[PDB]
Amino acid sequence: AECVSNENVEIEAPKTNIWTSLAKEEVQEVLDLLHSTYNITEVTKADFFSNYVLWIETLKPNKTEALTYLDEDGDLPPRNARTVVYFGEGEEGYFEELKVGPLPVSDETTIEPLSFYNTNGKSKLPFEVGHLDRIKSAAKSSFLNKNLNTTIMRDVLEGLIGVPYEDMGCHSAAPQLHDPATGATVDYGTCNINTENDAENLVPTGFFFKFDMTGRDVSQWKMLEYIYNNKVYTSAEELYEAMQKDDFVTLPKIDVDNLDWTVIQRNDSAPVRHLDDRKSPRLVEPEGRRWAYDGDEEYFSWMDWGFYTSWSRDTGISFYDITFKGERIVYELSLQELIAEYGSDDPFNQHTFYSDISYGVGNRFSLVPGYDCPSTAGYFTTDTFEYDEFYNRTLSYCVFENQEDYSLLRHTGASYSAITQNPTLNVRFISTIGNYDYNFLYKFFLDGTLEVSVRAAGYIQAGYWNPETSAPYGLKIHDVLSGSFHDHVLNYKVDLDVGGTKNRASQYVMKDVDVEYPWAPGTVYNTKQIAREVFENEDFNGINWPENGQGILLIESAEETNSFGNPRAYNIMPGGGGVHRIVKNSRSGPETQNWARSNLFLTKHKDTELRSSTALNTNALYDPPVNFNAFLDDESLDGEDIVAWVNLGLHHLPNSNDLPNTIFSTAHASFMLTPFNYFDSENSRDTTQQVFYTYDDETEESNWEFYGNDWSSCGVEVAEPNFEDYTYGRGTRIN
Amino acid sequence: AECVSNENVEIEAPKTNIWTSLAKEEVQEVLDLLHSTYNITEVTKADFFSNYVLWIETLKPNKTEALTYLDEDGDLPPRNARTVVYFGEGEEGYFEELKVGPLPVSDETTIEPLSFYNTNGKSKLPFEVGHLDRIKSAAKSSFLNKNLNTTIMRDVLEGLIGVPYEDMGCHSAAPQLHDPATGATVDYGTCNINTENDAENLVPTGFFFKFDMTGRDVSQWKMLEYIYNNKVYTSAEELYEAMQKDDFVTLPKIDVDNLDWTVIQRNDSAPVRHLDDRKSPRLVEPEGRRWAYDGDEEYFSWMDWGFYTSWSRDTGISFYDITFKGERIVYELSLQELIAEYGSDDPFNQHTFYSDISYGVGNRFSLVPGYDCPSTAGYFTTDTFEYDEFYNRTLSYCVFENQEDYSLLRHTGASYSAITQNPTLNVRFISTIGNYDYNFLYKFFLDGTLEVSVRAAGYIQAGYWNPETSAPYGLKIHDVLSGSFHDHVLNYKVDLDVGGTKNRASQYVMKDVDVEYPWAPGTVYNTKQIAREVFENEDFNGINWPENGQGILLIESAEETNSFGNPRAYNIMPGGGGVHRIVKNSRSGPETQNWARSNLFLTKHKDTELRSSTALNTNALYDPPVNFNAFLDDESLDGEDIVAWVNLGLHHLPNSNDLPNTIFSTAHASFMLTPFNYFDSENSRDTTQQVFYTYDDETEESNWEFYGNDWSSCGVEVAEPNFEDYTYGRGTRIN
């Protein structure tokens, strides 16, 4: 007999998604208004002296107006755009952030400087510390080719590396290094061997260079240094001549004829493991899908949870208005920034401190059905706007119900067994940013717990192994390859509003203590106690997870209690990857990523403290648009709207198990938000996905209660994934 | 079209399972020899002055003889039994451990004192610190009834608690408290309200008592104290008379008429959540099972892994000869002990320091098919012997292939996407020990990684909430109920033999450092470095996981390297629950659990250091059979057979989310064993469970390579679990 089929369920969201990305039509109206207001050049025709548009996206509503709309029948918040435009028509070039609205475009619409969420109080980012945009990238690539493809340098490179200039690629370290004291902007660079399989990061040559790129006039840019085997040369001629001498040491060259060790996919001449000719297990939905959605509003419901999603170019997916059993628990949950900070003996990796939101986390590729997500997943389309084009991205994120490999709870005793299954709602997106693949998962449980996790995979940014200097910074993982040591750190804005906005943050500290008890006078016991301590003010040092896990961190309602007098609370519980940066004082990130130095921070919510980083931060080393430390000014948190900024990380020291790629299983970080006296009891008990087995002692009869779930054998069709929907590329573009 | 069916595959183990439990026939021969050698009384007729048999099990082979058999065509090790017999026929009673073999019983068979694995050098455990066996339990229960069911005490109890003696149960704290200085043995106790649903732990009355139980003559045992509202009474009469006075404070009584808050299973009058009338997702095997086994030898193979299992009464499942790609990586992996140590204002919980192996972890209940394990699982039968009966336990552990909710790795770039699925082999057993349910999972991955995890659920051991004294030890979670604060700590013996037995233990320490580089003279950089440090000797302090995760712990081959010169290694990587005891100096566990004070210990392998605890430890407070600290005697680990003793734990402070039961999702601990330069590369690349997608730039054609896996739609029957195989109880017994 066939399993009972059910159709996918669609619902109407309670409210409008006021956080959603701009519609194509809204972007068009904004772009038109900009073109009519300013002299805007198309990006394909633009240079450092043109004006052109970079970005146009939603300027999300402020919280109080949002909550008045959601909870108190207020007006829709004004619909506005944030745009970033490069202005090069003046004596000095700069990027400027501008607000355009309200939308749709009407007689009330204005264009104004936008700076309220920048701690530095500026709408304008100077050229010298500007975004590494398509224009600046093209100029740098042209400048490098001009210098490295001369007759002499062609010879220097081939002689040192072993392949001609055509067979390598030269490129610059990020961030650039602007010195506000001198006005100079310099950058380092290296070369990697070209590959057919995107494995250039595994073949670094150990040839380095340094250049000055100060000012908008590229005719004045100059190569400063060539660096090779830890020696500095101040001209091509000096290096060429050094190489002709008999005392010159040339480091071992990459074996470019044998690069099969860089290849990810299966070698079809490899033997197959026993039984690997049988397909691996599959998750199926015997009675159809158990989550619902509003397609227009990107609102989701599952087992008494509800939330809206939003998408941005900088960060990818965000969540708003997360409710459980009819009560908002989180106003905003949003990934803010991802960094990768390397330590090295060499001037390329030692100067690498990536800000992934500068590149964009939300402007990448589709998910591969069946593999990136289970075949039971639903897929959603999002969009972004960059450089004159609207990008529609299908299969951008997925939603699926998992069956976890362990039950949610159980007990056996007194002639019964009671077990509850553990289905979870899962939202995933994957962001492949060059070499790295980041896999983001949000997992919701039946009791009101949410787990936020990240895993990493892809190609490592390796380094040339120099036996004299490389050992303190990495392991030798191939003939001339070091697995360069680096930190990954990610920041999440977790705007918990537990039993309303007015909250307190507390910790239950656990300690061993010597006590005497009234029932055994004179006898000292070494025992353990808890002590509740309130986080009364913003702490500049942040909060690091306690030694030996001897504490619990809570966000409590300031006024609401459960039936036993306990403040309603949620526990922020670290899972794996509760680490922060090792390095304290980076020349490549002095003030640009100051949230990354502790496990977590608690601040008073402000609309002006929207975000802990920006896409414009990375090259603004000393005066970034957002300096996170500006948020930390000793404000009372004692009965206030608190935001937690929670970090996840990994200290990655690649070894053989990272070649050809890093694996997701061991590169993992997570935290949980779990109810703590939030209810009077554990709130999964109403699920039907449980069994109650009883045995009668006298009659020797067993009884099985399955609460309406029929476990009888039935037939299902195991459906083919929507593979046809997957095409390579970073979105379908429309100029 | 129907999915291609395949039958379950059975294989022949490479060798005999020399670690397997005794056959019924072996146990019978041993029991017969004991009965012919000594005057043995049946346990149902026995007292403190009889002799009777407690336990008969396999005395596992010593390592060198085992390895000679497995690897060098040696003889089968001798087949021996360990038995424990209580001898009460002498002037003083004691338990004695005895070796019986070789088996089968022949003219060569002897019975000898067995003590080699006891650090205290004794085969005999004195009565005073004896096992809490069926005989001693019965005597204590009889003694308590004699004292608490008198006319006066019946009145005292009803008056204080609110229900008659028939409606409560009184019982003693574990461990007992023997004082070797005085020879006295005392114990504390309390009463809980009787329930129909095994929820007595949620209804503690706050009535306590203390008794002296010194010696085998129960006529000399005496009640010492009654303790109530933090006052001590030295007779029933004193307390009765105190209660008649007008100044007497009676603490608030349990509302025994309203205990629905203790009930686990669904209330069928509760509303159903949206779409919870659809069955939750199911894992299926479209082309059948992909692991194989030898049923007689309990040998398992899956995707180039192999191992044997063994079962014991004390600990449940153990693993031996774990190999991956034809090489042993772990000789022995075995759970050793589980403790639960409470802190409290009251004399019951403050004296509770459970040793779960004393009760037995491997003598519990069957798994519930479909709920405890996926319906695709295979189930295995094990056995134990206790008190004259052989117990056959069906559905004792399960083996299943999961599909993890994330892929093992991926990369997108250069017009391809390459993704590998993440199937894992999973071995589970669940041990419900009274109130607690422990869920043990061993998860094997395609690359050679193994994850060991535990989750906990069940009823908490709560405490009576006294507003004057309870607050430092727990939260008030119901009207008169405290969620008593406790540590769970579990010890695993992890006998890694990485590239042979001769190994080294090392750590890569991570630190920030200020350096100057040859390519930028005079410029100080704050960067980060690694430093390899060898653990040259056994450290009495053990090893605690590093602050901010700034280190990697390795077990390395002493001589074998990979192709790049790195020692072949495995990384012991902490996951969640990397915590140890808070309390340092317990009166209830002075010397009995000394492994629990750090995250992990490294020792030189010895057959005499078989196990870090014993079932006989818990009441032997100062001179236990095994004092783990005896293992730690500063021996060189520099090119030696190393064993790692790895702890997992939880500091549990129950809140509302633990009523009516604790949930498995948030009560979790794990560690991973992962290859680290063990191969030249990451070793999952040969799996067929992957996709290679390519896109041609010119022809606009996509190609999908699925390596023999057909994702076409097909029909399967979703099978009913083997529910008929599940019967309540702790094994089918045979006298």
Ligand SMILES: *[C@@H]1O[C@H](CO)[C@@H](O[C@@H]2O[C@H](CO)[C@@H](O[C@@H]3O[C@H](CO)[C@@H](O)[C@H](O)[C@@H]3O)[C@H](O)[C@H]2NC(C)=O)[C@H](O)[C@H]1NC(C)=O
């Ligand atoms: C959301 O909240 C933020 C923070 O409260 C609001 O920021 C404010 O934006 C206005 C413009 O709409 C800024 O006013 C301007 O100030 C400059 C500086 O003197 C002045 O030259 C202009 O004439 C104008 O008055 C204001 O400074 C800024 N406030 C802060 C604290 O930075 C924002 O308006 C809110 N958005 C919405 C949709 O209501």
Ligand SMILES: *[C@@H]1O[C@H](CO)[C@@H](O[C@@H]2O[C@H](CO)[C@@H](O[C@@H]3O[C@H](CO)[C@@H](O)[C@H](O)[C@@H]3O)[C@H](O)[C@H]2NC(C)=O)[C@H](O)[C@H]1NC(C)=O
């Ligand atoms: C596995 O290895 C252990 C540890 O090496 C062996 O333990 C040894 O067991 C023997 C008995 O078989 C003990 O010998 C006895 O010693 C006592 C004490 O003086 C003596 O009275 C007896 O006459 C007898 O000689 C021996 O002490 C003990 N060794 C240690 C270090 O404690 C065990 O025999 C091995 N098992 C197998 C199956 O080979």
Ligand SMILES: *[C@@H]1O[C@H](CO)[C@@H](O)[C@H](O)[C@H]1NC(C)=O
């Ligand atoms: C717009 O800018 C370009 C330079 O990019 C300039 O040549 C042109 O004259 C400007 N248009 C107007 C109307 O001033």
Ligand SMILES: *[C@@H]1O[C@H](CO)[C@@H](O)[C@H](O)[C@H]1NC(C)=O
């Ligand atoms: C580099 O120089 C060679 C000739 O010296 C030329 O053929 C080639 O096109 C140049 N490459 C680029 C990208 O300019």
Ligand SMILES: *[C@@H]1O[C@H](CO)[C@@H](O)[C@H](O)[C@H]1NC(C)=O
């Ligand atoms: C495939 O396997 C063969 C045989 O081991 C090996 O020589 C070759 O390097 C492999 N090819 C690739 C591209 O991985």
Ligand SMILES: *[C@@H]1O[C@H](CO)[C@@H](O)[C@H](O)[C@H]1NC(C)=O
């Ligand atoms: C984006 O793609 C979706 C799905 O194909 C489609 O509904 C929508 O019209 C697209 N948007 C635009 C403006 O191309």
Ligand SMILES: *[C@@H]1O[C@H](CO)[C@@H](O)[C@H](O)[C@H]1NC(C)=O
């Ligand atoms: C065996 O022990 C019992 C006491 O438990 C005793 O009465 C009996 O006589 C003993 N048997 C022999 C043969 O001595």
Ligand SMILES: *[C@@H]1O[C@H](CO)[C@@H](O)[C@H](O)[C@H]1NC(C)=O
């Ligand atoms: C307790 O005492 C009462 C009479 O006082 C009696 O009826 C009952 O059987 C006793 N219970 C036990 C278990 O001895």
Ligand SMILES: *[C@@H]1O[C@H](CO)[C@@H](O)[C@H](O)[C@H]1NC(C)=O
């Ligand atoms: C079932 O639900 C009803 C209505 O809320 C409640 O009164 C009762 O306590 C519940 N019964 C049990 C046994 O949980």
Ligand SMILES: *[C@@H]1O[C@H](CO)[C@@H](O)[C@H](O)[C@H]1NC(C)=O
């Ligand atoms: C234990 O149970 C298994 C499975 O039912 C059976 O094969 C075996 O004979 C049983 N052992 C004994 C001795 O009862």
Ligand SMILES: [Ca+2]
């Ligand atoms: Ca908040």
Ligand SMILES: [Ca+2]
């Ligand atoms: Ca502040």
Ligand SMILES: [Ca+2]
């Ligand atoms: Ca070993």
Ligand SMILES: [Ca+2]
């Ligand atoms: Ca030792």
Ligand SMILES: [Cl-]
């Ligand atoms: Cl400005």
Ligand SMILES: [Cl-]
């Ligand atoms: Cl110019």
